[PDB]
Amino acid sequence: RFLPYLWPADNAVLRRRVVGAILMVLLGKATTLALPFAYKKAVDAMTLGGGAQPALTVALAFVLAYALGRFSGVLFDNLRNIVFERVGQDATRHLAENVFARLHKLSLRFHLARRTGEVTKVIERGTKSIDTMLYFLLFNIAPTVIELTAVIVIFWLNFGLGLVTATILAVIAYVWTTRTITEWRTHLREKMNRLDGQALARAVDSLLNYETVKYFGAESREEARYASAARAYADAAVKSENSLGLLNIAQALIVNLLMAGAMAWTVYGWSQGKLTVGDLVFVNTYLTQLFRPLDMLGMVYRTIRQGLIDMAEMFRLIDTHIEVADVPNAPALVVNRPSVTFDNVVFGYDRDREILHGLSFEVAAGSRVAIVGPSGAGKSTIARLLFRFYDPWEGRILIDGQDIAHVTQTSLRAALGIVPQDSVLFNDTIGYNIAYGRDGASRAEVDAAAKGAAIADFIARLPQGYDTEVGERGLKLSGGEKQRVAIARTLVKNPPILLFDEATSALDTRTEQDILSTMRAVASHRTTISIAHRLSTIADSDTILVLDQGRLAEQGSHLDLLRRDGLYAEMWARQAAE
Amino acid sequence: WQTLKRFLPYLWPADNAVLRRRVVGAILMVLLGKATTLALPFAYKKAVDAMTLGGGAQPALTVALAFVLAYALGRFSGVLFDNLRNIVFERVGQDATRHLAENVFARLHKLSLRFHLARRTGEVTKVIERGTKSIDTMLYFLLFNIAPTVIELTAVIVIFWLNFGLGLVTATILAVIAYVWTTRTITEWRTHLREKMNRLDGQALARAVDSLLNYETVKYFGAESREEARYASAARAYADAAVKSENSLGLLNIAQALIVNLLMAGAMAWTVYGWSQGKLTVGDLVFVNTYLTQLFRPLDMLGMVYRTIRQGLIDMAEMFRLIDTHIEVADVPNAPALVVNRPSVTFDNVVFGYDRDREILHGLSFEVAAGSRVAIVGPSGAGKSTIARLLFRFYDPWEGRILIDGQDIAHVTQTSLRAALGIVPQDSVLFNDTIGYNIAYGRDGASRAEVDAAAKGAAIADFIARLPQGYDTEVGERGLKLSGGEKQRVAIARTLVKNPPILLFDEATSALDTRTEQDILSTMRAVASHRTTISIAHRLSTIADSDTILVLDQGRLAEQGSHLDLLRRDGLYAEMWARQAAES
Ligand SMILES: Nc1ncnc2c1ncn2[C@@H]1O[C@H](COP(=O)(O)OP(=O)(O)NP(=O)(O)O)[C@@H](O)[C@H]1O
Ligand SMILES: Nc1ncnc2c1ncn2[C@@H]1O[C@H](COP(=O)(O)OP(=O)(O)NP(=O)(O)O)[C@@H](O)[C@H]1O
Ligand SMILES: [Mg+2]
Ligand SMILES: [Mg+2]
């Protein structure tokens, strides 16, 4: 139940669009009720002839009534479609936009554990389900009931109470058989959807690892592992479509038994002198015009049922994946002095394995602090917690003495600029990626960042320059070039706090020192936290934080830590060993 | 087109199965259904026996039995035969869809590295889905919607010829010709809008998927609304195109209805006039009524059938264009296998660039000796990973050649060449599975002993042991739940499980502390005897103890020699090593 979302629609002229559309339907249905009465002009072709002329009433009245009735029915249906198409496309678009936004609202844990193909299939299928569900609720529930009741009333009036009882019995057995077969088919369809999602997810995962498959020559292995899920889906789909065919034959059996009974009773009434032969075609046309909407209601029920289950699936994917949230009436972060404080932070990604065991440190405002440690000590975890992708179990994190968990995430992330360990670029040009740092960045800012990131000369020597396409995830650039593009993005952003998580690992020391010296020259009060395994990158830092066993082991300058003969001294001795 | 003549050799292996029986049965079912549909109004035309020869006990027997037997049972048998065709053909159809999807996936993995580097994942996904669906529906309509419609059309024409002379048949063929004409005209009117619409849909989905891949980036720069707007733009463009297309379809439907109902009025008016002259009966009225409805019901879909066949043909031609253009490396005719007796590597005057407007390798020549441990260093952009990609033959050089044990890489099967190489790439990507599956991926059917030995060699065995789920820990998409060093060590473990004669580490230990790195390297040097090891690294301490160091600068080999030799020459490597020992 997500009701209030469509209510803004009446702000527009959608009223005028929907009412007329509904109006069209009604008029079309009206002609469909005046179509068999139009066909009892054959009575005037046999019984009593014509009041004025026997063949003139029949010819003229019949051509006009039957032809215009069928044409006007189709015309009103298509007029409804034509006038409602704009509203329908706008509704589908708004649903897709809101789904996309809610998908970007989800937590980092979800996107790290996601499967892109599965998410794609689930989103597509659920959006189609919701769209068709709303369409059927607007155009296939009230008109069908109207036709059903109207045709029942006409049979009541012109044929007593036998035809209506037979018709309601047929309709009730129809809805019962439909429910039974649909409930039988729900399991197969659910399994089929799940298998299709898994198959598409596996295919997309194989696409993401194309270079891996090439590196290990496992093309046939991936082909077979996709064919497995493909064949499972094929079996499930065969079962489901056979179920649908059986439902169709049962529905046809019921409707045609009603047909035989009705026309037999009508001709028996004729043979008893009660009814006319025109009543035969009367009941014929009315039963066909009643068989169309019941065939519509069967698929309407099936579609609403599976649309509800697919909607539940998609929402279950977009529901419970929001860990970090703003506290009620959260204020904005005020960065007067860009300091960072880790106050006894205890954190782990999952409760069964703890990574940070009460970590505490103080990055002074405007300082240039480094973070070292072995692989797995939890440095990138510090980076992720500072950006509040997760909340710590115990302790807290402060920026200028303010708890990040008690401030709006927007203001917190506006004060931070992160160059991640895994740098990912948009499948666009270098200019777009570098300008992405700030919305509406000027060419001057882009050039300044490219010069500060030591890629201005690289971009200048490129045949397409700033318009060079970087490919998916920027893999068409070299590693150092991608890292420098990320640095240029964060420089365009220009926040008070900067965090380089292994930002220059793919750079030669010369280019790295160019970037760092340019930053130290042009920056005045920027705080710069840097993580690196290459100790030469951070030797000239103001302070170095040695992380060990999820805690802070040592802290101090390069010379102090070397003289203290501690853990950092061992690192630098083993790395500076000739 | 000739694409269908070129595509047909693949539906030729399909002919060898029992699916001959299933398709024959399906066609038979169709034919029986059409026969019953034709016979339906023949005996609904026993309303004549109701009025004419009527008013007694015998007429009521003729009529009751006549309609009960023929009309009700006939329409039921028609629907039953339609669904019987569906049920007997469902297996063949699903198998055809599955085989098409498998072949599309295989060909997609057959394309060149350039394509996948420049690809758009969401666009590729949407295009593959739409094209496979279109080809499937095209084949389905060619098999089940061409012969039955022609049969019904000609049969109803013959029946009208017999029971109504030659005026009705001429009117009917005129209506049919104006119907197909209007359909073609409107379809070609909307085709451009449909192509633009499909293109916009693909672009929008590609943009959304790219935003998904950059979730962390969007979060880092707070551009959620920016991505929302950049997706909404293409979404509403697609919406406008779709509105235009569906309105075109609505006009097509009203025009078809106009034609059909004009023919209806004319035919039934002529029938009642013939009745008024004593020529025809009221049964002829109901006759022509049911026959005209049963004749224009299949045409109500051939309009879309033409659209579907056209778009399926163009998508098939697009597929053939994509496979005739996006495979740049191929095996020479009767290519032999690579015989690596002595794992040496040779770059003989290699001139290469990715695009012709920018050359990266300017006549590079070097000799990696068999069993040696050579390093490749240089500034960012010199073309070291380019050397790595050329050695694996992702691209072919413009000039020069590459040799492994004296054999030209371009004159050997790619499978044997790539089997002799094991590379840890600069961009390590893992499958969205467990650590055990990723490490075991190095060799098909690797044993637990090999996986454990490789995890020990990559210095990650202890880490996996201390994990709550051990080898079954999920690494996430692209292995982003592991750390950088852990992911690199998993990649090293993969290449160690593979255990080829030649190994290439392109920045393989950059995210590792020097201790773990030296553990891995010492373990390798201990267990390896005659393995050739090419290593690329900016951190020179990783490669200082190499047998030879190759300095690459702007695509040319500048210096060459041991660590001591290059340090003593006071050249570029000496400058790099002095600047890297910063002692600040
Ligand atoms: N999302 C996650 N789920 C589970 N475990 C995780 C997740 N992210 C990180 N880890 C683990 O947490 C530990 C610390 O990771 P991380 O903070 O990246 O350390 P790191 O040392 O700074 N990166 P590195 O230099 O490459 O070793 C490692 O054992 C990771 O495998
Ligand atoms: N597919 C491609 N299309 C265009 N340019 C490319 C492509 N691949 C690589 N390049 C360029 O080729 C040059 C060198 O690429 P690369 O082989 O990665 O050198 P590299 O030595 O590995 N750089 P790095 O790893 O950062 O130290 C760079 O200018 C790249 O941008
Ligand atoms: Mg890290
Ligand atoms: Mg590289």
Find where tokens 């392109």 sit.
B506
Burial class (CB in 10 A: 0-12, 13-18, 19+), A161: exposed
- For atom 27 of ligand 1, the residue with the nearest CA is A375
DSSP A326: P
Q: Of B135, B136, B107, which is closest to residue B323 (Cα–Cα)?
A: B107
Contact B188, B245 (CB under 8 A): no
Q: Is the dihedral of CA B467, B470, B476, B477 positive or negative?
A: positive
Residue B522 Cβ contacting ligand 1 at under 6 Å? no
Chain A hits for B210, CB-CB cut-off 8 Å, are 426-427, 472
Q: What gap in Å lies between CA A261 and CA A163, rounded to an integer?
A: 9
Give the residue, by CA position, lying nearest to ligand 1 atom 6.
B481
A418 is an annotated ligand-binding site residue: no
Per the CB < 8 A criterion, the answer to whether A538 and B584 are in contact is: no
Q: Which of B75, B86, B221, B355 to mutate to test the interface with A (most CBs of A within 10 A)?
A: B221
Give the span between the Cα atoms of A562 and A571, in whole angstroms.
10
Instruction: Return the bridge partners of B552, or none.
Output: B557
Cβ contact A100–B208 (<8 Å): yes
Give the Å distance between the CA of A475 and the centre of ligand 2.
9
In whole angstroms, give the CA distance from residue B253 to residue B255.
Answer: 5
**Given an 8 Å threshold on Cβ–Cβ distance, is B268 in contact with A62?**
yes
Q: What are the CA-CA distances from residue A423 to residues A487, B214, B295, B424 (Å)?
A: 10, 9, 63, 18
- A471 Cβ contact list (under 8 Å, min separation 6): A427, A477, B117, B118, B119
Centre of ligand 3 to C-alpha A359, Å, is 16
Identify the architecture of domain A340-576 in CATH. Answer: 3-Layer(aba) Sandwich (3.40)
**Of all helices (H) and strands (E), which one includes residue A531?**
strand A527-531
Q: Which of A39, A44, A60, A78 to mutate to test the interface with B (most CBs of B within 10 A)?
A: A78
* B381 Cα to the center of ligand 2, angstroms: 5
Which position has the token pair 């000496």? B574
A249: nearest CB among B57, B80, B513? B80
Dig out the tokens for A470 from the structure: 């970087």
Q: Which amino acid is at A500?
A: F
d(CA B456, CA B520): 9
Choice from A342, A353, A355, A548 to test ligand 1 binding pocket (greatest atom count within 8 A of CB):
A355
- Structure token pair of residue B458: 């990559």
- Listed in sequence order, the residues at least 6 apart from B311 whose beta carbon sits closer than 8 Å to its beta carbon are B134, B138, B194
Question: How many CB atoms sit inside 10 A of residue B320's CB?
Answer: 15
Q: CB-hemisphere CA count at 13 Å for B123?
A: 17
Does the beta carbon of A481 sit less than 6 angstroms from any atom of ligand 2? yes
Strands A356-363 and A340-347: antiparallel
Nearest atom within ligand 1 for CA of residue A531: 22
Orientation angle between helical segments B121-144 and B167-213, nearest 10 degrees: 160
For A559, nearest residue in chain B (alpha carbons) = B584
**Shortest CB distance from B272 goes to which of A55, A210, A576?**
A55
Instruction: Measure the CA angle with vertex B111, ends B110 and B112; round to 5°.
Output: 125
Q: Looking at the partner chain, which of A71, A114, A210 has a beta carbon nearest the beta carbon of B258?
A: A71
- B26 with B33: CB under 8 angstroms? no
Query: Looking at ligand 2, which atom is closest to the CA of residue B113?
Result: 1
In this structure, the dihedral spanned by the alpha carbons of residues B229, B231, B233 and B239, taken in order and rounded to 10 degrees, is -130
Q: Which two tokens stand for residue B537?
A: 């690294």
Contact B231 A100 (CB under 8 A): yes
Q: Does A562 touch chain B (CB under 8 A)?
A: no
Q: How far apart are the first and last CA of chain A?
A: 69
Distance B473 CA to ligand 3 centre (A): 18
The reply to whether residue A93 touches residue B125, judged by beta carbons under 8 angstroms, is no
Tell me the pairing of strands B502-506 and B421-424: parallel
Q: Got the DSSP string for B136-151?
A: HHHHHHHHHSSHHHHH
Contact A463/B357, CB-based, under 8 Å? yes
Could you write out the DSSP letters of every residue in B80-136? HHHHHHHHHHHHHHHHHHHHHHHHHHHHHHHS-HHHHHH--HHHHHHHHHHHHHHHH
The Cα B17–Cα A333 span in angstroms is: 71
A4-318 placed in CATH 1.10.540.10: no
- Give the H or E element holding residue A372: strand A368-372
> What are the boundaries of each domain within chain A?
4-318, 340-576
How many whole angstroms separate alpha carbon B159 and alpha carbon A254? Answer: 31
**What are the strands of the beta sheet with A551-556, ordered from one edge?**
A416-419, A497-501, A527-531, A368-372, A543-548, A551-556
For strands A394-399 and A402-403, give the pairing: antiparallel
Dihedral, CA of residue A518, residue A522, residue A527 and residue A531, to nearest 10: -10
What is the position in ligand 2's atom list of the atom closest to the CA of A458? Answer: 29
Calculate how far, in angstroms, residue A463's C-alpha sits from the geometric centre of ligand 2: 14
Answer for the pair A542, B547: CB distance below 8 angstroms, yes or no: no
A211 touches chain B (CB under 8 A): yes
Is the CB of residue A89 less than 8 Å from the CB of residue B235?
no
Closest C-alpha among B115, B217, B122 to residue A424 = B217
Is the distance from the beta carbon of residue B428 to the nearest atom of ligand 2 less than 6 Å? Answer: no
Cβ–ligand 2 distance for B479 under 6 Å, the answer no
* Distance (Å, whole) CA A271 – CA B62: 11
Q: Which CATH architecture has domain B345-580?
A: 3-Layer(aba) Sandwich (3.40)
Residues B575, B540: contact at Cβ < 8 Å?
Answer: no
Give the one of B47, B477, B486 whose C-beta lies nearest to A115's C-beta: B477
Alpha carbon distances (Å) from A186 to A182, A345, A424: 6, 49, 41
In terms of Cα–Cα distance, which of B45, B38, B40 is closest to B62? B45
At residue A362, the 3 state secondary structure works out as strand
Q: Give the pairing type, strands A497-501 and B556-561.
A: unpaired
The Cβ-side half-sphere exposure at B368, using a 13 Å CA radius, reads 32
- For B528, phi and psi rounded to 5 degrees? -85, 145
- Tokens encoding A232: 């499972």
d(CA A251, CA A295): 8
The answer to whether the beta carbons of residues B562 and A578 sit under 8 Å apart is no
* Token code pair at residue A318: 């977009």
Encoded tokens for A403 = 């708890």
Amino acid letter for position B112? S
| Phi-psi label, residue B515: left if phi above 0, alpha if psi -120 to 50, beta otherwise | alpha
| B347 half-sphere exposure, CB direction, 13 A CA radius | 26
Q: Tally C-beta pairs within 8 A across A and B.
A: 435
A371 sits in which H/E element: strand A368-372
Distance CA A130, CA A303 (A): 10
> For residue A516, how many C-alpha atoms fall within 13 Å in the half-sphere facing its CB?
22
Measured CA to CA, the distance from residue A556 to residue A561 in angstroms comes to 6
Integer CA distances (angstroms), A307 to A130, A143, A234, B154, in order: 6, 21, 21, 42
CA distance A475 to B506: 14
Does B239 contact A115 at a Cβ distance shorter than 8 Å? Answer: no
Say yes or no: B219 contacts chain A, CB-CB below 8 A: yes
Contact A129, A311 (CB under 8 A): yes
Rounded distance between C-alpha atoms, residue A134 and residue A81, angstroms: 15
Which of the listed residues B114, B351, B360, B509 should we mutate to test ligand 2's pocket, taking the one with most ligand atoms within 8 A of CB? B360
Decide: helix, strand or coil at residue A287.
helix
Residue A340 Cα distances to A382, A390, A500, A556, angstroms: 11, 17, 15, 16
Residues in chain A: 578
Buried b / exposed e over B142-152, threshold 16 CB at 10 Å, is ebbbeebbeeb
Q: Answer yes or no: do B125 and A117 touch at CB < 8 A.
A: yes
State how far the Cα of A199 lies from the Cα of A201, in Å rounded to an integer. 5
H helix intervals, B420-540: 435-440, 448-457, 461-465, 484-498, 514-527
| Encoded tokens for A98 | 């809101």
Q: Do B480 and A62 touch (CB under 8 A)?
A: no
> How are beta strands B556-561 and B548-553 bridged, if at all?
antiparallel
Segment holding B558, helix H or strand E: strand B556-561
CB atoms within 10 A of CB B570: 10
Contact A54 B208 (CB under 8 A): no
Query: Does residue B351 contact residue B362 with C-beta atoms inside 8 Å?
Result: yes
- The CATH number corresponding to B2-324 among 3.30.450.70, 1.20.1560.10, 1.20.58.480, 3.40.50.1000 equals 1.20.1560.10
SS3 for A209?
coil
> Dihedral of CA B180/B182/B187/B189: which sign?
positive
Question: Please, where are the H alpha helices in A375-454?
Answer: 379-386, 409-414, 430-435, 443-452
Helix (H) or strand (E) holding B247: helix B224-276
For residue B18, report the phi and psi dihedrals to the nearest 5 degrees.
-80, 0
Q: Is the CB of B481 under 6 A from ligand 1?
A: yes
Torsion angle in degrees (nearest 10) through CA of B281, B285, B291, B297: 180
Atom of ligand 2 lying closest to residue B118 CA: 1
Beta-bridge partners for A527: A497
Residue from A198, A204, A190 nearest A243 by CA: A190
What number of CA atoms fall less than 13 Å from residue A402's CA on the CB side? 19
Q: Which ligand minimizes its atom distance to the CA of B382?
A: 2
**Tally of CB atoms within 10 A around A561:** 23
Instruction: For residue A328, say whether it is annotated as part of any ligand binding site.
Output: no
Using CB atoms, which residue from A63, A114, A502 is nearest to B268? A63
| Sign, CA torsion B189/B192/B195/B200 | negative
Picking from A234, A198, A195, A225, the residue whose alpha carbon sits closest to that of residue B106 is: A225
Q: Closest ligand 1 atom, CA of B463? A: 29
Kindly report the protein residue whose alpha carbon is nearest to atom 24 of ligand 2.
Answer: B380
Burial of B449 (0-12, 13-18, 19+ CB in 10 A): exposed
Q: Which residues pair with A3 in a beta bridge?
A: none
B548's tokens = 């030879």
Which residue's entry shows tokens 């820990």?
Answer: B473
Dihedrals phi, psi of A507, to nearest 5 degrees: -115, 145
Task: Spell out which residues of chain A touch residue B212, defining contact as CB-CB under 8 Å.
Answer: 103, 111, 116, 119
Rounded distance from Cα A133 to ligand 2 centre (Å)? 51
| Contacting residues for A362 by C-beta, under 8 A, at least 6 apart | A339, A340, A341, A342
Sheet holding B421-424, edge to edge: B421-424, B502-506, B532-536, B373-377, B548-553, B556-561
Q: Is B234 on the interface with A (CB under 8 A)?
A: no
Ligand 1 binding pocket mutation candidate from A111, A321, A349, A389 (most atoms within 8 A of CB): A349
The response to whether A165 counts as a known ligand-binding position is: no
A298 marked as part of a ligand binding site = yes
Q: Please name the amino acid found at residue B430.
A: L
- Check residue A345 and report its DSSP letter: E
Q: Are B407 and B578 in contact (CB under 8 A)?
A: no
Cα dihedral across residues A519, A524, A530, A535: positive or negative: positive
Name which of A39, A44, A38, A72 is nearest A57 in CA terms: A44
* Rounded distance between C-alpha atoms, residue A300 and residue A132, angstroms: 9
Q: How many CB atoms lie within 10 A of CB B398?
A: 12
Beta strands, E only, A93-147: none
When scoring B201, B273, B538 by the number of chain A Cβ atoms within 10 A, the one with the most, hence best to mutate, is: B538
Q: Do B121 and A208 touch (CB under 8 A)?
A: yes
Map tokens 């179920």 to a residue.
Answer: A243
In the stretch 133-152 of chain B, residues with CB closer than 8 A to chain A read: none
The DSSP annotation for B196-214 comes to: HHHHHHHHHHHHHHHHHHT
Q: What is the DSSP letter of B483?
A: -
- CB within 8 A of B133, min separation 6: which ones? none
Q: 3-state DSSP call for residue B376?
A: strand
DSSP state of A427: S
Which of the 8 DSSP states describes residue B46? T
- Write down the H helix ranges in A160-276: 162-208, 210-216, 219-271
| CA–CA separation, B168 and B162 (whole Å) | 10
| Contact of B370 with B546, CB cutoff 8 Å | no
